[PDB]
Design a protein around this ligand. Structure first.
Ligand SMILES: OC[C@H]1O[C@@H](O[C@H]2[C@H](O)[C@@H](O)[C@H](O[C@H]3[C@H](O)[C@@H](O)[C@H](O[C@H]4[C@H](O)[C@@H](O)[C@H](O[C@H]5[C@H](O)[C@@H](O)[C@H](O)O[C@@H]5CO)O[C@@H]4CO)O[C@@H]3CO)O[C@@H]2CO)[C@H](O)[C@@H](O)[C@@H]1O
Ligand SMILES: [Ca+2]
Ligand SMILES: [Cl-]
Ligand SMILES: [Zn+2]
Length: 509
Protein backbone atom coordinates (compact mmCIF):
# COMPACT_ATOMS: atom_id res chain seq x y z
CA UNK A 1 0.00 0.00 0.00
CA UNK A 2 1.66 3.18 -1.28
CA UNK A 3 0.91 6.17 0.96
CA UNK A 4 1.91 9.75 0.12
CA UNK A 5 1.43 12.98 2.08
CA UNK A 6 0.41 16.19 0.34
CA UNK A 7 0.71 19.44 2.30
CA UNK A 8 -0.71 22.72 1.01
CA UNK A 9 -0.53 26.26 2.42
CA UNK A 10 -2.79 28.62 0.47
CA UNK A 11 -1.11 31.63 2.09
CA UNK A 12 2.49 30.68 1.27
CA UNK A 13 4.62 31.16 -1.84
CA UNK A 14 1.80 32.84 -3.73
CA UNK A 15 2.90 33.67 -7.25
CA UNK A 16 0.98 34.45 -10.44
CA UNK A 17 0.76 31.72 -13.07
CA UNK A 18 1.12 33.29 -16.52
CA UNK A 19 -2.04 32.53 -18.50
CA UNK A 20 -0.01 31.91 -21.67
CA UNK A 21 1.74 28.64 -20.71
CA UNK A 22 -1.14 26.54 -22.06
CA UNK A 23 -0.57 27.19 -25.75
CA UNK A 24 0.06 25.23 -28.92
CA UNK A 25 1.64 25.64 -32.35
CA UNK A 26 -0.86 23.44 -34.22
CA UNK A 27 -4.65 23.31 -34.20
CA UNK A 28 -5.52 21.01 -31.31
CA UNK A 29 -8.62 19.36 -29.90
CA UNK A 30 -8.10 21.36 -26.72
CA UNK A 31 -8.71 24.80 -25.24
CA UNK A 32 -5.40 26.70 -25.56
CA UNK A 33 -4.31 30.08 -24.22
CA UNK A 34 -1.60 30.99 -26.72
CA UNK A 35 -0.99 30.28 -30.39
CA UNK A 36 2.41 30.39 -32.07
CA UNK A 37 2.95 30.82 -35.79
CA UNK A 38 6.45 29.39 -36.08
CA UNK A 39 8.63 26.45 -36.97
CA UNK A 40 10.68 25.61 -40.05
CA UNK A 41 8.21 26.84 -42.67
CA UNK A 42 8.09 30.37 -41.21
CA UNK A 43 11.76 31.20 -41.87
CA UNK A 44 11.23 31.81 -45.58
CA UNK A 45 7.61 32.99 -45.39
CA UNK A 46 6.95 36.03 -47.62
CA UNK A 47 4.10 38.10 -46.20
CA UNK A 48 3.70 40.01 -49.47
CA UNK A 49 2.49 36.92 -51.35
CA UNK A 50 2.25 34.20 -48.67
CA UNK A 51 4.74 31.87 -50.38
CA UNK A 52 7.22 29.93 -48.23
CA UNK A 53 9.95 27.28 -48.45
CA UNK A 54 9.99 23.82 -46.85
CA UNK A 55 13.78 23.72 -46.74
CA UNK A 56 15.18 20.27 -45.90
CA UNK A 57 11.76 19.08 -44.72
CA UNK A 58 10.67 18.83 -48.35
CA UNK A 59 13.22 19.20 -51.15
CA UNK A 60 13.53 22.97 -50.57
CA UNK A 61 10.15 23.53 -52.26
CA UNK A 62 8.77 27.08 -52.51
CA UNK A 63 4.98 26.86 -52.62
CA UNK A 64 1.60 27.64 -51.07
CA UNK A 65 1.89 25.06 -48.28
CA UNK A 66 1.18 27.54 -45.46
CA UNK A 67 -1.99 28.83 -47.13
CA UNK A 68 -3.27 25.28 -47.58
CA UNK A 69 -2.23 23.97 -44.17
CA UNK A 70 -3.44 27.15 -42.48
CA UNK A 71 -6.85 26.73 -44.07
CA UNK A 72 -6.73 30.16 -45.71
CA UNK A 73 -9.70 30.79 -48.03
CA UNK A 74 -8.62 30.51 -51.68
CA UNK A 75 -9.91 34.01 -52.33
CA UNK A 76 -7.38 35.48 -49.89
CA UNK A 77 -4.35 33.54 -51.14
CA UNK A 78 -3.03 36.58 -52.98
CA UNK A 79 -3.85 38.91 -50.08
CA UNK A 80 -0.80 40.12 -48.11
CA UNK A 81 -0.31 38.33 -44.77
CA UNK A 82 -3.47 36.24 -45.25
CA UNK A 83 -1.59 33.28 -43.77
CA UNK A 84 -0.94 35.28 -40.61
CA UNK A 85 -4.25 37.15 -40.42
CA UNK A 86 -6.16 33.87 -40.84
CA UNK A 87 -3.97 32.42 -38.07
CA UNK A 88 -4.71 35.35 -35.76
CA UNK A 89 -8.39 35.59 -36.72
CA UNK A 90 -8.74 31.93 -35.70
CA UNK A 91 -6.99 32.56 -32.39
CA UNK A 92 -9.21 35.54 -31.59
CA UNK A 93 -12.34 33.58 -32.53
CA UNK A 94 -11.33 30.82 -30.09
CA UNK A 95 -10.77 33.41 -27.36
CA UNK A 96 -6.99 32.83 -27.35
CA UNK A 97 -5.42 35.81 -25.51
CA UNK A 98 -1.88 35.53 -26.92
CA UNK A 99 -0.69 35.26 -30.52
CA UNK A 100 3.03 34.93 -31.32
CA UNK A 101 4.06 35.61 -34.91
CA UNK A 102 7.48 34.61 -36.22
CA UNK A 103 9.20 37.30 -38.29
CA UNK A 104 11.88 36.54 -40.90
CA UNK A 105 15.59 37.00 -40.15
CA UNK A 106 17.52 34.25 -41.97
CA UNK A 107 17.93 36.74 -44.79
CA UNK A 108 15.57 35.82 -47.63
CA UNK A 109 11.99 34.71 -48.25
CA UNK A 110 10.27 32.90 -51.12
CA UNK A 111 9.78 35.05 -54.19
CA UNK A 112 7.42 32.49 -55.70
CA UNK A 113 5.65 29.17 -55.28
CA UNK A 114 7.22 27.45 -58.29
CA UNK A 115 8.50 24.40 -56.44
CA UNK A 116 12.05 23.15 -55.66
CA UNK A 117 14.83 25.72 -55.42
CA UNK A 118 18.08 24.25 -56.79
CA UNK A 119 21.41 24.63 -55.05
CA UNK A 120 22.44 26.84 -57.95
CA UNK A 121 19.49 29.05 -56.97
CA UNK A 122 20.83 29.63 -53.45
CA UNK A 123 19.96 33.18 -52.33
CA UNK A 124 20.37 35.68 -53.72
CA UNK A 125 18.61 34.61 -56.93
CA UNK A 126 15.33 35.11 -58.81
CA UNK A 127 13.81 32.56 -56.44
CA UNK A 128 14.28 34.80 -53.39
CA UNK A 129 13.53 38.29 -52.12
CA UNK A 130 15.97 39.90 -49.69
CA UNK A 131 14.58 40.75 -46.28
CA UNK A 132 15.24 44.18 -44.77
CA UNK A 133 14.04 44.94 -41.26
CA UNK A 134 13.42 48.67 -41.80
CA UNK A 135 11.86 50.00 -45.01
CA UNK A 136 13.20 53.51 -44.45
CA UNK A 137 10.43 54.81 -46.68
CA UNK A 138 6.66 55.23 -46.17
CA UNK A 139 4.79 51.98 -45.46
CA UNK A 140 2.17 50.67 -47.85
CA UNK A 141 -0.75 48.37 -47.08
CA UNK A 142 -0.27 47.01 -50.60
CA UNK A 143 3.42 45.97 -50.65
CA UNK A 144 5.29 45.93 -53.96
CA UNK A 145 5.80 42.29 -54.95
CA UNK A 146 7.88 43.36 -57.94
CA UNK A 147 10.91 44.88 -56.22
CA UNK A 148 13.66 42.77 -54.63
CA UNK A 149 12.87 43.35 -50.95
CA UNK A 150 10.42 42.37 -48.22
CA UNK A 151 10.24 44.64 -45.16
CA UNK A 152 9.60 43.32 -41.67
CA UNK A 153 8.46 46.61 -40.17
CA UNK A 154 6.04 47.12 -43.08
CA UNK A 155 4.73 43.62 -42.36
CA UNK A 156 4.19 44.56 -38.71
CA UNK A 157 2.61 47.86 -39.75
CA UNK A 158 0.06 45.94 -41.83
CA UNK A 159 -0.91 43.81 -38.82
CA UNK A 160 -1.04 46.71 -36.35
CA UNK A 161 -3.21 48.64 -38.81
CA UNK A 162 -5.63 45.73 -38.94
CA UNK A 163 -5.68 44.64 -35.29
CA UNK A 164 -4.37 47.61 -33.32
CA UNK A 165 -1.10 47.40 -31.39
CA UNK A 166 -0.09 44.83 -28.76
CA UNK A 167 -1.66 46.90 -25.97
CA UNK A 168 -5.15 46.51 -27.45
CA UNK A 169 -7.59 43.57 -27.00
CA UNK A 170 -7.14 42.26 -30.55
CA UNK A 171 -3.51 43.16 -31.15
CA UNK A 172 -0.82 40.58 -31.78
CA UNK A 173 1.22 40.54 -28.57
CA UNK A 174 4.49 39.00 -29.68
CA UNK A 175 6.92 38.50 -32.52
CA UNK A 176 9.69 35.93 -32.75
CA UNK A 177 13.09 36.50 -34.31
CA UNK A 178 12.77 33.71 -36.85
CA UNK A 179 13.16 30.06 -35.82
CA UNK A 180 16.14 27.93 -34.72
CA UNK A 181 18.98 30.10 -36.10
CA UNK A 182 21.68 27.54 -35.24
CA UNK A 183 19.94 25.20 -37.68
CA UNK A 184 19.47 27.68 -40.53
CA UNK A 185 22.45 26.22 -42.42
CA UNK A 186 20.98 22.71 -42.04
CA UNK A 187 17.25 23.31 -42.48
CA UNK A 188 17.47 26.25 -44.90
CA UNK A 189 20.81 25.94 -46.77
CA UNK A 190 19.25 27.57 -49.85
CA UNK A 191 18.62 30.72 -47.79
CA UNK A 192 21.45 30.75 -45.24
CA UNK A 193 24.15 28.22 -46.30
CA UNK A 194 26.79 29.32 -43.75
CA UNK A 195 26.56 28.43 -40.06
CA UNK A 196 25.17 31.45 -38.22
CA UNK A 197 27.69 33.32 -36.08
CA UNK A 198 27.04 34.72 -32.62
CA UNK A 199 27.79 38.24 -33.86
CA UNK A 200 25.35 37.91 -36.76
CA UNK A 201 22.50 36.67 -34.59
CA UNK A 202 22.91 39.54 -32.11
CA UNK A 203 23.19 42.14 -34.86
CA UNK A 204 20.06 40.79 -36.54
CA UNK A 205 18.12 40.41 -33.29
CA UNK A 206 18.88 43.99 -32.26
CA UNK A 207 18.05 45.43 -35.68
CA UNK A 208 14.78 43.54 -36.06
CA UNK A 209 13.66 44.34 -32.51
CA UNK A 210 14.32 48.04 -33.07
CA UNK A 211 12.41 47.97 -36.35
CA UNK A 212 9.43 46.22 -34.78
CA UNK A 213 9.21 48.40 -31.67
CA UNK A 214 9.21 51.60 -33.71
CA UNK A 215 5.95 50.38 -35.26
CA UNK A 216 4.54 48.76 -32.11
CA UNK A 217 6.38 49.84 -28.95
CA UNK A 218 4.10 47.46 -27.01
CA UNK A 219 4.99 44.28 -28.88
CA UNK A 220 7.16 41.71 -27.10
CA UNK A 221 10.24 40.37 -28.86
CA UNK A 222 10.98 36.64 -28.40
CA UNK A 223 14.41 35.20 -29.12
CA UNK A 224 16.45 33.27 -30.09
CA UNK A 225 14.04 30.32 -30.40
CA UNK A 226 16.96 27.90 -30.02
CA UNK A 227 16.30 24.30 -31.11
CA UNK A 228 17.96 22.51 -28.20
CA UNK A 229 20.77 22.31 -25.66
CA UNK A 230 23.73 22.41 -28.08
CA UNK A 231 22.40 25.76 -29.33
CA UNK A 232 21.87 26.92 -25.73
CA UNK A 233 25.50 26.22 -24.94
CA UNK A 234 27.52 27.14 -28.03
CA UNK A 235 24.94 28.13 -30.65
CA UNK A 236 25.77 24.78 -32.26
CA UNK A 237 29.53 25.39 -32.28
CA UNK A 238 29.10 28.84 -33.87
CA UNK A 239 32.16 29.78 -35.99
CA UNK A 240 32.95 32.75 -33.77
CA UNK A 241 32.04 31.29 -30.37
CA UNK A 242 35.71 30.76 -29.50
CA UNK A 243 36.11 34.54 -29.40
CA UNK A 244 32.62 35.89 -28.71
CA UNK A 245 32.09 33.41 -25.90
CA UNK A 246 35.19 34.26 -23.89
CA UNK A 247 34.12 34.65 -20.27
CA UNK A 248 30.61 33.24 -20.79
CA UNK A 249 29.43 29.94 -19.29
CA UNK A 250 27.15 29.35 -22.28
CA UNK A 251 25.64 31.12 -25.27
CA UNK A 252 22.50 31.78 -23.21
CA UNK A 253 24.44 34.25 -21.03
CA UNK A 254 26.04 35.89 -24.07
CA UNK A 255 22.67 36.41 -25.72
CA UNK A 256 21.10 37.93 -22.62
CA UNK A 257 24.12 40.11 -21.87
CA UNK A 258 24.46 41.45 -25.43
CA UNK A 259 20.73 42.08 -25.81
CA UNK A 260 20.72 43.98 -22.51
CA UNK A 261 23.78 45.93 -23.64
CA UNK A 262 22.01 46.96 -26.85
CA UNK A 263 18.83 47.81 -24.96
CA UNK A 264 20.83 50.00 -22.58
CA UNK A 265 22.45 51.85 -25.47
CA UNK A 266 19.15 52.19 -27.33
CA UNK A 267 17.15 53.34 -24.32
CA UNK A 268 14.50 50.60 -24.19
CA UNK A 269 14.05 46.85 -23.77
CA UNK A 270 14.82 45.02 -27.01
CA UNK A 271 14.46 41.47 -25.67
CA UNK A 272 11.25 40.73 -23.80
CA UNK A 273 11.27 36.96 -23.73
CA UNK A 274 14.14 34.46 -23.77
CA UNK A 275 12.73 31.86 -26.18
CA UNK A 276 13.98 28.25 -26.42
CA UNK A 277 12.72 24.89 -27.68
CA UNK A 278 12.95 21.83 -25.44
CA UNK A 279 12.46 18.35 -26.87
CA UNK A 280 13.44 15.92 -24.08
CA UNK A 281 16.53 13.84 -24.77
CA UNK A 282 15.53 11.60 -21.84
CA UNK A 283 15.68 7.89 -22.75
CA UNK A 284 14.09 4.72 -21.42
CA UNK A 285 13.78 1.18 -22.69
CA UNK A 286 16.52 1.92 -25.21
CA UNK A 287 14.84 4.86 -26.93
CA UNK A 288 14.17 8.59 -26.66
CA UNK A 289 10.80 9.41 -25.03
CA UNK A 290 9.76 11.59 -27.98
CA UNK A 291 10.21 11.33 -31.76
CA UNK A 292 8.91 7.94 -32.83
CA UNK A 293 8.83 6.45 -29.34
CA UNK A 294 7.06 3.09 -29.01
CA UNK A 295 4.04 3.21 -26.61
CA UNK A 296 4.38 -0.53 -25.99
CA UNK A 297 7.80 0.01 -24.38
CA UNK A 298 7.00 0.19 -20.65
CA UNK A 299 10.48 1.39 -19.72
CA UNK A 300 10.20 4.28 -22.17
CA UNK A 301 6.77 5.16 -20.73
CA UNK A 302 8.15 5.14 -17.19
CA UNK A 303 11.08 7.31 -18.27
CA UNK A 304 8.55 9.69 -19.85
CA UNK A 305 6.76 10.05 -16.51
CA UNK A 306 9.98 11.14 -14.77
CA UNK A 307 11.50 13.28 -17.55
CA UNK A 308 9.67 16.47 -16.47
CA UNK A 309 11.85 16.48 -13.34
CA UNK A 310 14.85 17.49 -15.45
CA UNK A 311 13.07 20.84 -15.74
CA UNK A 312 13.24 21.63 -12.01
CA UNK A 313 14.50 18.79 -9.77
CA UNK A 314 18.21 18.98 -8.84
CA UNK A 315 18.16 15.39 -7.58
CA UNK A 316 17.00 13.94 -10.90
CA UNK A 317 19.50 12.80 -13.53
CA UNK A 318 17.90 11.53 -16.74
CA UNK A 319 19.43 8.98 -19.09
CA UNK A 320 20.68 11.17 -21.94
CA UNK A 321 23.84 12.90 -23.14
CA UNK A 322 22.57 16.01 -21.37
CA UNK A 323 22.05 14.24 -18.04
CA UNK A 324 25.48 12.62 -18.35
CA UNK A 325 27.68 15.46 -19.59
CA UNK A 326 25.81 18.66 -18.75
CA UNK A 327 24.87 18.32 -15.08
CA UNK A 328 26.27 21.82 -14.51
CA UNK A 329 23.31 23.09 -16.55
CA UNK A 330 20.57 21.05 -14.83
CA UNK A 331 17.81 21.37 -13.73
CA UNK A 332 17.19 23.33 -16.93
CA UNK A 333 14.56 25.92 -15.95
CA UNK A 334 16.39 27.13 -12.82
CA UNK A 335 19.58 27.49 -14.86
CA UNK A 336 17.84 29.50 -17.58
CA UNK A 337 16.14 31.71 -14.95
CA UNK A 338 19.44 32.08 -13.06
CA UNK A 339 21.08 33.34 -16.25
CA UNK A 340 18.27 35.84 -16.73
CA UNK A 341 18.65 37.18 -13.19
CA UNK A 342 22.39 37.51 -13.78
CA UNK A 343 22.55 39.00 -17.28
CA UNK A 344 19.16 40.57 -18.05
CA UNK A 345 16.76 40.82 -15.06
CA UNK A 346 13.11 41.29 -15.96
CA UNK A 347 13.41 39.14 -19.07
CA UNK A 348 10.66 36.54 -19.37
CA UNK A 349 11.08 32.88 -20.30
CA UNK A 350 9.14 30.89 -22.90
CA UNK A 351 9.33 27.32 -24.20
CA UNK A 352 7.84 27.81 -27.66
CA UNK A 353 8.29 24.19 -28.73
CA UNK A 354 8.28 20.99 -26.69
CA UNK A 355 6.87 17.46 -26.80
CA UNK A 356 7.26 14.71 -24.22
CA UNK A 357 5.98 12.05 -26.60
CA UNK A 358 3.46 9.29 -25.99
CA UNK A 359 0.81 11.78 -27.06
CA UNK A 360 -1.75 9.02 -27.61
CA UNK A 361 -0.76 7.23 -24.39
CA UNK A 362 -1.69 7.86 -20.76
CA UNK A 363 1.94 8.65 -19.86
CA UNK A 364 2.02 11.36 -22.51
CA UNK A 365 -0.98 12.91 -20.79
CA UNK A 366 0.42 12.68 -17.28
CA UNK A 367 3.79 14.08 -18.40
CA UNK A 368 2.01 16.93 -20.23
CA UNK A 369 -0.03 17.79 -17.11
CA UNK A 370 3.17 17.59 -15.06
CA UNK A 371 5.06 19.92 -17.41
CA UNK A 372 2.26 22.50 -17.32
CA UNK A 373 2.22 22.39 -13.53
CA UNK A 374 5.98 22.96 -13.60
CA UNK A 375 5.77 25.86 -16.06
CA UNK A 376 3.19 27.48 -13.81
CA UNK A 377 5.04 26.88 -10.56
CA UNK A 378 8.45 28.05 -11.77
CA UNK A 379 7.47 31.21 -13.61
CA UNK A 380 7.52 30.33 -17.30
CA UNK A 381 5.73 33.10 -19.24
CA UNK A 382 4.55 31.34 -22.41
CA UNK A 383 4.62 27.78 -23.72
CA UNK A 384 3.43 26.22 -26.95
CA UNK A 385 3.32 22.45 -27.52
CA UNK A 386 4.45 21.20 -30.93
CA UNK A 387 2.34 18.33 -32.24
CA UNK A 388 -0.96 17.66 -34.02
CA UNK A 389 -4.47 16.75 -32.89
CA UNK A 390 -3.72 13.02 -32.83
CA UNK A 391 -2.08 13.47 -29.42
CA UNK A 392 -5.35 12.93 -27.56
CA UNK A 393 -3.72 12.39 -24.19
CA UNK A 394 -1.49 15.44 -24.58
CA UNK A 395 -4.67 17.40 -25.27
CA UNK A 396 -6.28 15.92 -22.14
CA UNK A 397 -3.31 17.14 -20.11
CA UNK A 398 -3.88 20.64 -21.48
CA UNK A 399 -7.66 20.64 -20.95
CA UNK A 400 -7.13 19.45 -17.37
CA UNK A 401 -5.81 22.98 -16.80
CA UNK A 402 -7.74 25.04 -19.37
CA UNK A 403 -11.21 23.45 -19.59
CA UNK A 404 -11.55 20.49 -17.23
CA UNK A 405 -15.37 20.46 -17.04
CA UNK A 406 -16.00 21.16 -20.71
CA UNK A 407 -17.54 24.54 -19.94
CA UNK A 408 -14.59 26.81 -19.23
CA UNK A 409 -13.55 25.55 -15.81
CA UNK A 410 -9.83 26.10 -15.36
CA UNK A 411 -6.93 25.83 -12.90
CA UNK A 412 -6.42 28.87 -10.68
CA UNK A 413 -4.12 31.67 -11.86
CA UNK A 414 -2.23 32.02 -8.57
CA UNK A 415 0.17 29.24 -7.55
CA UNK A 416 0.40 28.32 -3.86
CA UNK A 417 2.65 26.07 -1.78
CA UNK A 418 1.90 22.41 -2.41
CA UNK A 419 4.44 19.75 -1.38
CA UNK A 420 4.41 15.98 -1.86
CA UNK A 421 6.36 13.44 0.19
CA UNK A 422 7.18 11.35 -2.92
CA UNK A 423 8.13 13.26 -6.08
CA UNK A 424 8.88 10.04 -7.94
CA UNK A 425 5.45 8.38 -7.69
CA UNK A 426 3.48 11.63 -7.75
CA UNK A 427 3.23 15.30 -8.61
CA UNK A 428 0.81 17.86 -7.20
CA UNK A 429 0.18 21.52 -8.02
CA UNK A 430 -2.19 23.87 -6.19
CA UNK A 431 -3.64 27.28 -7.00
CA UNK A 432 -6.33 29.80 -6.13
CA UNK A 433 -7.99 32.56 -8.16
CA UNK A 434 -6.45 36.01 -7.78
CA UNK A 435 -5.86 36.59 -4.06
CA UNK A 436 -8.92 34.58 -2.98
CA UNK A 437 -8.59 31.03 -1.64
CA UNK A 438 -12.34 30.36 -1.46
CA UNK A 439 -11.81 27.76 -4.17
CA UNK A 440 -8.61 25.72 -4.02
CA UNK A 441 -7.55 23.96 -7.23
CA UNK A 442 -5.31 20.91 -7.10
CA UNK A 443 -3.71 19.00 -9.97
CA UNK A 444 -2.89 15.54 -8.56
CA UNK A 445 -0.89 13.09 -10.67
CA UNK A 446 -0.29 9.47 -9.73
CA UNK A 447 2.69 8.16 -11.67
CA UNK A 448 2.45 4.73 -10.03
CA UNK A 449 2.35 2.39 -13.05
CA UNK A 450 0.34 -0.57 -11.79
CA UNK A 451 -0.80 0.30 -8.30
CA UNK A 452 -3.10 2.88 -6.74
CA UNK A 453 -1.64 5.53 -4.44
CA UNK A 454 -3.27 6.79 -1.26
CA UNK A 455 -2.84 10.50 -0.64
CA UNK A 456 -3.23 12.09 2.77
CA UNK A 457 -3.95 15.80 2.36
CA UNK A 458 -3.26 18.44 5.00
CA UNK A 459 -4.19 21.98 3.99
CA UNK A 460 -3.68 25.33 5.71
CA UNK A 461 -6.19 27.91 4.48
CA UNK A 462 -8.27 30.80 5.77
CA UNK A 463 -11.30 28.81 4.61
CA UNK A 464 -12.69 25.48 5.79
CA UNK A 465 -13.24 23.25 2.76
CA UNK A 466 -16.29 20.97 2.83
CA UNK A 467 -16.29 19.51 -0.69
CA UNK A 468 -13.82 18.58 -3.39
CA UNK A 469 -15.23 18.00 -6.85
CA UNK A 470 -13.10 15.83 -9.14
CA UNK A 471 -12.39 15.58 -12.86
CA UNK A 472 -9.87 13.10 -14.26
CA UNK A 473 -8.50 11.12 -17.18
CA UNK A 474 -6.77 7.74 -17.20
CA UNK A 475 -6.07 4.69 -19.35
CA UNK A 476 -9.80 4.13 -19.66
CA UNK A 477 -10.19 7.31 -21.72
CA UNK A 478 -8.49 10.58 -22.56
CA UNK A 479 -11.88 12.25 -22.10
CA UNK A 480 -11.84 14.13 -18.82
CA UNK A 481 -14.77 12.90 -16.76
CA UNK A 482 -16.16 14.10 -13.42
CA UNK A 483 -15.71 11.64 -10.57
CA UNK A 484 -17.32 11.13 -7.17
CA UNK A 485 -16.68 14.19 -4.99
CA UNK A 486 -14.51 14.16 -1.85
CA UNK A 487 -16.85 14.88 1.07
CA UNK A 488 -15.18 13.83 4.29
CA UNK A 489 -12.84 16.70 5.04
CA UNK A 490 -11.96 17.15 8.70
CA UNK A 491 -10.18 20.41 9.57
CA UNK A 492 -8.98 20.67 5.97
CA UNK A 493 -7.58 17.14 5.97
CA UNK A 494 -8.75 14.14 3.94
CA UNK A 495 -7.53 10.91 2.38
CA UNK A 496 -7.94 10.20 -1.32
CA UNK A 497 -6.78 7.08 -3.14
CA UNK A 498 -6.10 7.40 -6.86
CA UNK A 499 -5.87 4.44 -9.27
CA UNK A 500 -2.60 3.81 -11.11
CA UNK A 501 -1.68 6.23 -13.91
CA UNK A 502 -4.45 8.77 -13.29
CA UNK A 503 -4.45 12.56 -13.56
CA UNK A 504 -6.91 14.49 -11.39
CA UNK A 505 -8.08 18.07 -10.95
CA UNK A 506 -9.61 18.63 -7.52
CA UNK A 507 -11.64 21.74 -6.78
CA UNK A 508 -12.18 22.40 -3.08
CA UNK A 509 -14.72 24.86 -1.70
O1 LIG B 1 -1.63 20.18 -51.67
C1 LIG B 1 -1.36 19.87 -53.04
C2 LIG B 1 0.13 20.02 -53.32
O2 LIG B 1 0.88 19.11 -52.49
C3 LIG B 1 2.29 19.31 -52.65
O3 LIG B 1 2.99 18.39 -51.79
C4 LIG B 1 2.92 18.82 -50.42
C5 LIG B 1 2.29 17.73 -49.56
O4 LIG B 1 0.93 17.53 -49.96
C6 LIG B 1 2.33 18.15 -48.10
O5 LIG B 1 1.85 17.08 -47.28
C7 LIG B 1 3.76 18.49 -47.68
O6 LIG B 1 3.70 18.95 -46.32
C8 LIG B 1 5.00 19.06 -45.71
C9 LIG B 1 5.53 20.48 -45.85
O7 LIG B 1 5.92 20.74 -47.20
C10 LIG B 1 6.75 20.68 -44.94
O8 LIG B 1 7.14 22.06 -44.96
C11 LIG B 1 6.39 20.28 -43.51
O9 LIG B 1 7.53 20.51 -42.68
C12 LIG B 1 7.21 20.38 -41.30
C13 LIG B 1 7.77 19.06 -40.77
O10 LIG B 1 6.99 17.97 -41.27
C14 LIG B 1 7.72 19.04 -39.24
O11 LIG B 1 8.38 17.87 -38.76
C15 LIG B 1 8.44 20.28 -38.71
O12 LIG B 1 8.50 20.22 -37.28
C16 LIG B 1 9.75 20.75 -36.83
C17 LIG B 1 9.63 22.24 -36.52
O13 LIG B 1 9.36 22.97 -37.72
C18 LIG B 1 10.94 22.74 -35.90
O14 LIG B 1 10.80 24.11 -35.52
C19 LIG B 1 11.27 21.89 -34.67
O15 LIG B 1 12.51 22.33 -34.10
O16 LIG B 1 11.41 20.52 -35.07
C20 LIG B 1 10.17 20.01 -35.57
C21 LIG B 1 10.33 18.52 -35.89
O17 LIG B 1 10.75 17.83 -34.71
O18 LIG B 1 7.71 21.44 -39.13
C22 LIG B 1 7.77 21.58 -40.56
C23 LIG B 1 7.01 22.83 -41.00
O19 LIG B 1 7.52 23.97 -40.30
O20 LIG B 1 6.05 18.89 -43.50
C24 LIG B 1 4.84 18.67 -44.25
C25 LIG B 1 4.44 17.20 -44.15
O21 LIG B 1 5.47 16.38 -44.71
O22 LIG B 1 4.28 19.53 -48.53
C26 LIG B 1 4.32 19.10 -49.90
C27 LIG B 1 4.97 20.20 -50.75
O23 LIG B 1 4.19 21.39 -50.65
C28 LIG B 1 2.70 19.01 -54.09
O24 LIG B 1 4.11 19.24 -54.26
C29 LIG B 1 1.91 19.87 -55.07
O25 LIG B 1 2.19 19.45 -56.41
C30 LIG B 1 0.42 19.71 -54.79
O26 LIG B 1 -0.33 20.60 -55.63
CA1 LIG C 1 8.57 43.75 -51.96
CL1 LIG D 1 18.86 27.10 -32.94
ZN1 LIG E 1 -7.04 15.38 -30.74
Amino acid sequence: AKVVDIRIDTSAERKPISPYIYGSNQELDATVTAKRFGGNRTTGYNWENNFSNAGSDWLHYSDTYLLEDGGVPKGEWSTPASVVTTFHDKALSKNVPYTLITLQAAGYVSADGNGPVSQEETAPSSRWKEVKFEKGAPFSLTPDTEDDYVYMDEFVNYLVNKYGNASTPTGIKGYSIDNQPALWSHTHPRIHPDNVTAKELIEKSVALSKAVKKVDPYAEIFGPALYGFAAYETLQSAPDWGTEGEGYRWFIDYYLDKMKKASDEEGKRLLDVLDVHWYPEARGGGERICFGADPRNIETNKARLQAPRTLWDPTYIEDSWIGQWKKDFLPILPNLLDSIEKYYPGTKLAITEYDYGGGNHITGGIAQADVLGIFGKYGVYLATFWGDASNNYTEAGINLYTNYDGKGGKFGDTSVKCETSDIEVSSAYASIVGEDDSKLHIILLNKNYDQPTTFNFSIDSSKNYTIGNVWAFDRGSSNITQRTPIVNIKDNTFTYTVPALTACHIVLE
